[PDB]
């Protein structure tokens, strides 16, 4: 029962990878330390992809071939995710992508643990703009996630009659200069909303950049669907709260099963390890993989597949299930506010977990 | 009532593009010689994108912001599509693309007119398998289709017990360095179908390539999505013949609609323009395109849009209609095996057209 | 005696590659009607890259290896230069680069005919800092030539103490966004002068699109490499005049040399080929290729090579040579002002063509 | 007195970078331990860049722009360097890179310590083919340095009558499947050597794969430009004995300042740190760039520059000096052979340092 881990821990996404990989960890533990899965214990084995597409494959590549894996969890960037796909699906092995993401795609061996944009920036968008205005600005990473992100976004803006004003991208390891031409048109553009799809290291900078162009007084807020305690731990204060976020979970969740796993992520993960939505997707994902596995009662793909839409789990955000039609999640969608001391404050939760739908048709979408 | 083509002249694909530009021209001969549209008569324009998807986008921008046209029938190559798709959405205008394409996409702005991946390669593999044989090799353009196209090809072999033994891809522009190593791979794979995904030019280049490989007896079929009259008219009979595609129409389809279609083409088309299932489908689309704004009276495109999935389309494959939940068609779905004298001769073909199902879960898939 | 001209038709640089193809025909007109070359007519074959690097592989790959071609004339953006490079080294053929460009390359198979940037920038950059100020912005298509002109101009500036204010990069096929955001740029940095290193098409869209920005009155003067008679005849008399540019002919000059080639040029280009320093390039190597060839008395590369560096010849900018050093030419260099009415007006011109230094060290440059 | 230490510690190349780091540190202790600089201490700084071009140009401009450093050493492979160069040009800052390159460079802002084309190439062509054949086959990393070591060595085959059979490339982050494909076609091939541009990581993939690919008997050596210590470390003593390499060092040449600088390796370098040529390189040019301050008394770059040029050292490899011409050094060429017992035992040795020539023009080069 070895499990192959597939979280950066150097470059650009280091910081929520590396939160992602301790949620996941500690998931191990936690079946190990329960006589483990038919006695023999799970082991989970490690390389640090440092954020490269290439190097995915390449450490998907070797643990498949070479260490015997065929059960993963890992991948952040959706073009990270993407190299690894062929492979899973060449080894018939099975990846846990606990993540959120553009959506418009399916793989038999991937199974989706973040939102597709229907679960997060379908309600998002009813928020901003039935609460903020309708004026908006797309700043992203230049990658397939951020594009793809806000193509649908548009779509989103273009129904309840918002709209996009500008729509900025760039590049994943950007120089101030990049930075600073960026935030000049995010300035000039006079949004009532700034949308982020920045990811990494860029995140804080991007923040704290368009805080200072805006000195004192009224600045858009910055909605973000990747944003999480990770990058949030790199900003001052001023410049992280009232920024809004949606995702399935926050590490202030009122709620039994969220200090479950909080209380105990604070006892195993290393101080440079956040609690995120992340770490929790992460976290129910190998749960589920090790369960379905006790259930099957082996290691075998096949036998712990068929088993894996069968059990709902009780997860630190709520129920949670993979629906078998797709392979991705329902998932409880919630958008909480930064706090001027940085905390999330829920601000909304949907009254049940969303039912995943990757093939993004926003008319026949329901509508917040 | 102004209609942009978006159609290579030049470059790898600028026979197939040039069989569907005139495919389109003559839907606007007759819709034209028809009274047009409203007593005023529908124009259409035309620049060379050659293939290049930066001068697709910059065509199809030239072609909205400065001649305001609002209605487009083109694109080819899936990279090509995607360039142009942000700027029908942002400024609201709509494309037409007649064409087979890998799936896994929606936008409100675009009418998908050519199969999806359950309309041509699901129908194909199970033929292929339960006709000659489980051992195929796939080689393709190394572009998006390609590579998404045999992303769902793989899966599909697996369902049916097939295998997948090589995955090659060469340059859209190849050199015969290129095509050589591969035609040897191929080769030395010793399927029983090879699976091509190879576009334009060096589709003959291929065909005629494997065939001389193999010299005298036996080698495998060459099955394809794409190679239409366009290609095989750049080949040797015997290099052509007993080659198999799947596609919604063919040239030789025994019926009064088709004989009409064609007849009519043979009266209009140049000589270096032949008569394919493209060329269909940029004609059928084009029809409705006018049908819609008569209906509507007016060249609006919400206007038009409304009726654009009430109207259905005698069109010279059979009955057509554009479903409104994912914007892609109902096409009949025929495999047609070539002459040794160069026809293609229909061997299979759907008892009725198959909905459009872009998001391709195999699984859920009808098998046939 | 066969030749081979690679020089796109559609694409990019179509206009001034057009200007160079029958800058070249000339060439072998005249070759040819002085009873060719050894009693045998010297025969081009020709064919359409499209300004696509690829394309040009495939063409001059196509030439060399089936219609046995050994010597070419063509090529303008050096990433298409680069791509047939190999290929005419690999099969020992001669390729005649008729154009300006970076520097920095050896190839014992590339003949380069137009100036190298000792050539025209380290001349050029001294005229507008003592001329018109030391404040530049620089602004180019996104590829090696501009990337790599800027390089060595930057230190140019710098050797002369001016300032690169900014340095601005637009796709070859740009969005007029992609233009208004550049030019918004190049007018809040209040420069002395703008160095353009944008090529074919978009050369005139950035001059008007700049002239516009400015209005009424100052607005600082566009020095170019690259921008002839080609691209001038696209743009408004207001919009033209006043700009400045580099290179070693101009239709415009004084002399017996020019007007001979000049009134000759008038009876054969087709009324969209314009007279330009690019096609006065073409014409001398062409000539020189063949007046080598009938010393050698043969069509053989190695003899006429021998010969290639003995021949001086009186190309309509003067005396030229190529230098067996380094294979580039020795070359006038002009600097022209255009016209109220659109006239290139030499306003500075070498005292003796400049040899060729394709190694840019500025500080072992000769202080101009 | 700060400097900048641009070395990868992850990614393919991130074994030769260590060793290279810790070179320069070592460097940096003996100036220190003499008194430093002026009585202050010399301090260094160090940042991962994992063997990204844009992870370093980030490094370089965070080192730069927040740090103030003016000094600089490190990069290694050539994009990467590439990508830094604009960043020093622009904020006037030094840095030395130990690495050996392709060559067709030059930035006033840059020290070349590594050995260009006809410093290593050019001996080693000719000692190749007067000692094992005549024919070869080039595999190569696919980027920038590979193709353009290839070009060259392919004009300096030609020149000495030898033939270029293959040019085949695999991803700085290979499959076992891109090894294997390519290592076949290096088997078919027939050559009398292997001419190795891969770098990194899939060296003694490469290497090892040749091993196995051949069995017992008779497989044509593997010479490499940058097979170091660092790669050798990695591979089976049959696999690395009868490999052919050029450089200025190697840590076994008998002499008194190698030894010297060996035996202080061994003092101060980890385990995971081996002793290479390029921390050979690293560690004269950390010295000199010392020295030059000292004798300028300054840590002003201009101050430093003057003195950089008339600062010879005594490296380990011999006596070391940069031209001012060109920015690159006067440097030895060793061609070494390794041991049944993996140690380099040099076979040639240039009777002098070969002085810079980076625009190599083979005919104009001295025959070895």
Chains 1, 2, 3, 4 share one sequence.
Request: charged share 25%; proline share 7%.
């Amino acid at each position: 029962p070895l499990i192959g881990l597939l979280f950066s821990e150097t470059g650009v996404t280091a910081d929520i990878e590396r939160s992602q990989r301790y949620g996941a960890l500690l998931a191990v533990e936690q079946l190990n330390r329960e006589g483990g899965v038919g006695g023999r214990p799970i082991e989970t084995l490690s390389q640090d992809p440092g954020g490269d597409p290439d190097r995915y494959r390449l450490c998907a590549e070797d643990f498949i071939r070479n260490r015997g894996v065929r059960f993963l969890v890992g991948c952040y960037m959706s073009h990270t995710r993407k190299a690894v796909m062929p492979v899973v699906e060449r080894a018939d092995a099975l990846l846990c992508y606990p993540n959120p993401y553009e959506g418009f795609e399916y793989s038999p061996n991937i199974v989706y643990g973040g939102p597709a944009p229907n679960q997060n920036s379908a309600p998002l968008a009813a928020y901003l703009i039935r609460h903020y205005g309708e004026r908006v600005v797309f700043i992203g990473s230049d990658y397939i996630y951020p594009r793809e992100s806000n193509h649908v976004m548009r779509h989103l803006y273009r129904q309840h009659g918002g709209t996009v004003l500008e729509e900025i991208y760039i590049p994943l390891y950007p120089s101030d200069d990049d930075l600073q031409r960026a935030v000049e048109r995010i300035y000039q553009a006079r949004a009532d909303v700034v949308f982020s799809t920045v990811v990494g290291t860029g995140t804080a900078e991007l923040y704290r950049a368009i805080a200072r162009r805006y000195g004192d007084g009224r600045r858009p807020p910055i909605a973000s669907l990747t944003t999480s305690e990770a990058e949030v731990a790199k900003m001052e204060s001023d410049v992280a709260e009232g920024q809004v976020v949606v995702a399935p979970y926050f590490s202030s969740i009122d709620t039994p099963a969220s200090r479950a796993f909080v209380q105990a992520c604070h006892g195993f993960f290393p101080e440079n390890a956040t609690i995120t939505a992340w770490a929790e997707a992460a976290y129910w994902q190998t749960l589920l993989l090790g369960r379905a596995a006790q259930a099957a009662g082996n290691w075998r793909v096949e036998d712990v597949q068929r088993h894996l839409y069968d059990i709902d789990i009780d997860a630190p955000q709520g129920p949670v299930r993979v629906e078998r039609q797709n392979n991705h999640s329902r998932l409880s969608s919630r958008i909480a506010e930064i706090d001027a001391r940085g905390v999330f404050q829920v601000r909304w939760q949907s009254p049940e977990p969303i039912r995943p739908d990757p093939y993004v048709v926003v008319h026949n979408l329901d509508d917040w």
